[PDB]
Design a protein around this ligand. Structure first.
Ligand SMILES: C[N+](C)(C)CCOP(=O)(O)O
Ligand SMILES: C[N+](C)(C)CCOP(=O)(O)O
Lengths: 128, 128
């Protein structure tokens, strides 16, 4: 009955947008375990760009979020079939092609972003 | 057995500091209900100063925090004996004199801040 959901991300300067996506992932089925993967500082820099918070900071903040049952920190940059078997993951939840193989397997669940609520957008707000 | 704890605050741009205080309040006893009071936009401005986020935004973010069982939004600026009876509150938890009457009654539990982890401190970090 219990369904294992995996959501990965940088989770830099966690904001309501991230929180809503985690909520959505958690609530995909009636009984879930939400595992959250937090990306390493080096791979995030190499593959994405600037990260403000350290892995420790990003991970520690996620611990306080209601929807998070387990954290993998650091997580792999790229999800593999071996990773899913290792952690007994039933679905991967992410914003929506590197996820084609997951969709082909029936193991992909889309979740939605929220614009405007960003931590950086809040500073853009204040300046006046 | 279940102990009702009340923590109030502005909770503007919620950060690890706030989250740790809420955790501390929640864990004061083995079985607790943590009620969190979120201050109104006008009273925060009048009595404290600038608030970046609206009451709705501050309240919505707190909903996602593991330790929060109930929210009173807006909450009164000043705690009263009548308020404690109304919500069946056993202890008030806050950083540590407007709380003298609570300490005299045995209804005050100190919780600690964390400096450096602030949302604004993180912007102070990045600029370089
Ligand atoms: C590649 N990755 C999925 C592990 C990290 C990027 O995820 P995200 O922060 O864009 O949601
Ligand atoms: C007066 N008050 C306690 C309701 C709001 C101020 O609380 P805080 O944000 O300084 O912890």
């Amino acid at each position: 009955k219990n369904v294992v959901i995996y959501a990965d991300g940088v989770y830099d300067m966690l904001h309501l947008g991230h929180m809503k996506q985690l909520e959505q992932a958690k609530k995909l089925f009636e009984n879930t375990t939400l595992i959250v993967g937090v990306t390493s500082d080096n791979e995030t820099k190499l593959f994405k760009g600037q990260v403000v918070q350290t892995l420790e900071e990003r991970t520690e903040t996620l611990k306080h979020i209601r929807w998070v049952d387990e954290i993998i920190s650091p997580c792999p940059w790229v999800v593999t079939p071996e990773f899913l078997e290792k952690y007994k993951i039933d679905y991967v939840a992410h914003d929506d092609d590197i996820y084609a193989w997951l969709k082909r397997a029936g193991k992909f669940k889309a979740t939605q972003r929220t614009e405007g609520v960003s931590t950086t957008d809040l500073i853009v707000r204040i300046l006046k």
